[PDB]
Amino acid sequence: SSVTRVPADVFINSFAAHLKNRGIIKCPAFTDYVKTGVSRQYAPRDADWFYIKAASVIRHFYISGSHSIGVAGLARKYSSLQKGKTTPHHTKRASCKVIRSIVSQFLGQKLLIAGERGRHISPNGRKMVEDFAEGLQ
Amino acid sequence: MRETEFCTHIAHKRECRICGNYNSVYRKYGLFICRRCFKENAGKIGFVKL
Amino acid sequence: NDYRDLLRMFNTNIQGKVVLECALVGIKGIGRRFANVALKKANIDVHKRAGELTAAEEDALMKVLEDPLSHGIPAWMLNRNNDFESGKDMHILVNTIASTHRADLERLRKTRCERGVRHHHNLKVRGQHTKSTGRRGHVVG
Amino acid sequence: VALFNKWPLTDVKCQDESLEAYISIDNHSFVPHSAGRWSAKRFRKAKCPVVERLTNSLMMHGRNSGKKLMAMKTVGEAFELINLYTGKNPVQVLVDAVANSGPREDSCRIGKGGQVRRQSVDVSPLRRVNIGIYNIATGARKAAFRKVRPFAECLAEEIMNAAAGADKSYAISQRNSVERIAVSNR
Amino acid sequence: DLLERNDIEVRERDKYTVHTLGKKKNSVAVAFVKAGKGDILVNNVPLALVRPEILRTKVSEPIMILGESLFKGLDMNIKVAGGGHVSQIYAVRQAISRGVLASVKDEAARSELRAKLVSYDRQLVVSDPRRCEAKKFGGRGARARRQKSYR
Amino acid sequence: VDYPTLFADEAAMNEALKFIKNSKCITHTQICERLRVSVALAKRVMRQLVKSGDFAIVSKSSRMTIFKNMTKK
Amino acid sequence: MHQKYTIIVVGKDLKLVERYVKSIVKEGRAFGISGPCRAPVRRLTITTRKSPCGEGTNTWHRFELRMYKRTFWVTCGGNDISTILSKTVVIPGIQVTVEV
Amino acid sequence: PNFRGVEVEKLATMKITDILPKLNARCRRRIGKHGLSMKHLRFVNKLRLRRAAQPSQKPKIVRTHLRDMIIFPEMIGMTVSVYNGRQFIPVEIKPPMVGRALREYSMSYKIVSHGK
RNA sequence: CAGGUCUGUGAUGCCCUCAGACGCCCUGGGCCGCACGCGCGCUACACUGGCGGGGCCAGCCGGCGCCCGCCAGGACGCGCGGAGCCCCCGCCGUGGCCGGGACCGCGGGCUGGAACGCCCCCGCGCACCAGGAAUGUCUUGUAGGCGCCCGCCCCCACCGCG
């Protein structure tokens, strides 16, 4: 609740700014060459895509809460159809390396704590992500 | 010798349990049953038409 | 802004109206030699339009196209990597790609390769069914 | 209650007495997305909301089959363009556009032995309501296709041009062409 | 994922006297309703704001019709599983329409409101009978068959 | 074909604006058709009209965006 | 006394598996048997072209053998659980298996 | 003339393991990642016996049914006949041929020979 | 019904084969070779569209964590999990173009005794700008659009069962 009250799209764009201004996450810069997974054919031109991706991934970690999420699992959330072959399009989850890198920074910034199976949002992180949503709206 | 060469494993040999035919062996479940042989013995197993 | 109507560089007149990544695609295999977007890190703004390019930007763009390790872009973005005769991961661009298909074809012909005969007699290698839909105009080819 | 809760839904009226019973604006309700058994019985489609049938013919040619969401949004973007240029209710212009665009006369074989001559016939008011909605819909699509103008701008003008009676509208010209053929083999 | 073993377990009891279900082609709205402030959450998201835009007005459609002030004083924790984006919105609306009526109590005034709402939008209190049909061996669809090569 | 797509207007900025204003309501592609300019160019021009207070966004979408002048009389 | 026992009842026929359930409930009064749990039926499904030879319209024979499993948990001594099982009525082609 | 950036003769005096770091992805999997068969090793045994150690420079032929054999640089400038399923086909293994399969260089089909 | 299957069947008449076997194994290739004509499908022919992000909704019925890698994949571990379309914002601006993805030039990988299979990436950028005469399928959760499951499966589907 309250995270739901903010339009999630509004929160994600602002969180990328919050990450950049407050210095949280720190985009790797090796992300430049990578496209967001096998499906994508043209590669991200937004240029703030790692900050944009990071903002939603931490919001997703908050949305699950205690449920616990994994690097391959987050890629299923970001899945898109793969096109360009005579054979009909089939959905393709994103590449693991970029997503795994995002989860690693959050554990360092105390936004993530390992649980059974996948990692889950840390208590310090839970307050920060929720505090930003209420503050923004 | 013929002994040292007879049936050197080259592939899995799968045959209907009822007819011993390689074609259409069927591995969907534990039933390694011929597709044609299946229909004849479906009733004893108890598989039934809807 | 000062713009170049047709940019003659790389033997390809480059239209000024198109966006820079899209216009650069017209330069042979380059424009995709950067996977359609690697000048962004190297030098130029990713989407400034082709004619907005400036002499300094042009010199910078050409240097990274000429040298792969200038900005250390990986061999995954590059083309030929093991190289049968070169042992080098250099991206093959401009006139060289046109030369390379003919150059490789000479090797495909010199060794009596099964692929080579199909290449000279203008057939298709594999493609599964090659009798039914291979035909293009009363002939496959 | 207003169409799409933007363009005010007032007492929109029908100028035709034939297309009065078969065109329905009384049951118009925010968002023509109501899920109804309108394609049931033989005459239930009569009580359909005028905009809903127009919206349904937008998802056509197989390219957009089933895309009611997009079709409603195109109806919505068109509704505003009409509202801006004519400065009145789109739901009133849409009623005038359908009544005028409906061919009044039709022709049919009559199955007179071997003869296949298309002897002229009168039209069903309901059939007229459908042909008019169909003509507006297929004309709007022809105008777009590979053109800079996108479908929303094409759909709005097609309704606006059908309402006057201008020959340019595909909807009006189809009405005119059919009735010219109908008198020719009357 | 529709019709899960526990109908509502994220919230259990806690004054949730009213219970209702809205069905829409594999869309089940398990609605937990209590007499609360008058604002509602669907799948833990506010009823007034849902992600699709065109569908947002449809989701608020029963509310205004069966008296918005009447709905005020009722809080809901409706959850929709299964179905699809359009199917889900219609099933929440069916649950919402039924949810106010059961709580209001059956009297002439409740009955008058029920008649007014079900006339305005039909099949709002009646679950859609239509259920997706089954493909047969003839072709790719329930009714469609393969192309006849030799007539 | 409306080929120019880089804020091409040089001395026809005012002309393009007189045209834009002459129309009580405009659309990005209606600019491109009426005048000789690309729709992408119109997107950047429309901005310096909205911000100045010349035109008002009646309906917004990533696809269709509709603008109507506030006054013009 | 209180040692938990997990029992599984599997049958091709729903009615035949139901008979064991009704018997277990009656003989479970003595040793406090849990209420039955009816599992989602897991079905072995074989759709086969009916024709041995391809001649004819391709036609499909749909064969289904859904398997029904019922779950019983009794925190009772092993002699007591054996007493429920032996005493409860047994029908051929019905499988009861106990896991500790 | 250069092979993988070596002058050309540099390739000839090499064991497959020596040229394995500079090889194609597929020929790393068969040689090192998965290893070779003893009968395939017997092919190398037949060739060390039939190598410069074999007496005379006149042809010793050597006919092999074995087809899927990545060729080592040891076979540079070697000619042998490999079965196409009907006829052993003489092929000149050479520095360009190395690092690829022996199966492709012998040919079993009929080159279409169509136009009838 | 001379429909089709003796090439499913310790089904089977009768003839042939029977030790250099029409037994059975072992190897390598064949069925996938293409001057061609045709049947079933798939993807296209773009703005009702692609492309870059952001949300996120399934059923048949089904599990995952960690790190390494551009992916592909793999190692490590363990008890479990889930689509597209669509919606919101951007970019293109009617150009075979940022429509479309066909061969081929490499490269990196997988299943594999073994590619002659598949996968991914970096090139490439095939016709087709809506199909002649002809015909086919089809009525409510219906057609179509849009994905997923499962079958045969060493690997593989554009196919069929769903």
Short mmCIF file of C-alpha atoms in Angstrom, two decimals, chain E residues 20 22 59 61-63 65-66 71 76 78 90-104 110 113-114 117-118 121 123-126:
data_model
loop_
_atom_site.label_atom_id
_atom_site.label_comp_id
_atom_site.label_asym_id
_atom_site.label_seq_id
_atom_site.Cartn_x
_atom_site.Cartn_y
_atom_site.Cartn_z
CA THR E 20 -19.12 -11.73 -3.09
CA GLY E 22 -17.87 -12.07 -9.90
CA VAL E 59 -14.06 -0.24 -13.47
CA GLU E 61 -18.92 2.28 -13.74
CA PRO E 62 -21.03 0.32 -11.11
CA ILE E 63 -19.79 2.59 -8.27
CA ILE E 65 -24.60 3.95 -10.55
CA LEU E 66 -25.52 2.13 -7.31
CA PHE E 71 -20.58 2.59 -1.58
CA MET E 76 -13.03 -3.98 -0.22
CA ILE E 78 -11.23 -7.94 -3.91
CA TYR E 90 -15.64 -7.03 -15.78
CA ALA E 91 -15.40 -9.56 -12.94
CA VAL E 92 -14.38 -6.89 -10.37
CA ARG E 93 -17.37 -4.82 -11.54
CA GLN E 94 -19.74 -7.80 -11.05
CA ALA E 95 -18.30 -8.39 -7.55
CA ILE E 96 -18.58 -4.65 -6.76
CA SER E 97 -22.23 -4.52 -7.94
CA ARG E 98 -23.19 -7.55 -5.81
CA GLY E 99 -20.95 -6.41 -2.89
CA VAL E 100 -22.89 -3.20 -2.12
CA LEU E 101 -26.29 -4.98 -2.43
CA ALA E 102 -25.70 -7.78 0.11
CA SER E 103 -24.39 -5.30 2.73
CA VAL E 104 -27.23 -2.76 2.14
CA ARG E 110 -32.27 -1.89 -1.95
CA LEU E 113 -31.33 0.31 -6.56
CA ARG E 114 -30.69 -3.24 -7.79
CA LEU E 117 -28.28 -0.75 -11.82
CA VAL E 118 -29.05 -4.05 -13.63
CA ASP E 121 -25.71 -2.24 -17.45
CA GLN E 123 -25.34 -8.89 -17.00
CA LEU E 124 -23.69 -6.81 -14.22
CA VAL E 125 -25.17 -9.07 -11.47
CA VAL E 126 -25.24 -12.13 -13.82
#
